[PDB]
């Protein structure tokens, strides 16, 4: 907002950079093996159920 | 004590249920099995010979 109307109007790219560095391990971690969760029992007994 | 240390090590590999993979001596089935083999054991071969 602080743009001249014949001078530059280059804007870094800071945030974005971080955010889309960021991202992709973050995916990486909790998708790459096909299953997202995995329950698991307490005694021996809810084994079927877990 | 054989039967503890395979329990243990089934559940450290990582599997809570340890009767899928091994029987428990005390079991009734055991019990069986173990009075079947001490019962094939009721007379070797040469004493009767002896006699």
């Known amino acids: 907002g602080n743009e001249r109307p014949g001078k530059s109007a280059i804007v870094s790219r800071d945030v974005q950079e971080t955010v889309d560095w960021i991202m992709p391990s973050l995916m990486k971690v909790f998708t790459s093996g096909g299953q997202v969760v995995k329950y698991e029992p307490q005694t021996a007994e809810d084994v079927e159920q877990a | ?51």
């Open chain 2, 1 to 51: 004590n054989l039967y503890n240390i395979l329990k243990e090590v089934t559940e450290n590999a990582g599997y809570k249920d340890p009767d899928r993979f091994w029987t428990n001596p005390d079991s009734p089935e055991a019990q069986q099995a173990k009075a079947i083999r001490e019962q094939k054991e009721a007379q070797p071969k040469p004493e009767d010979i002896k006699a």
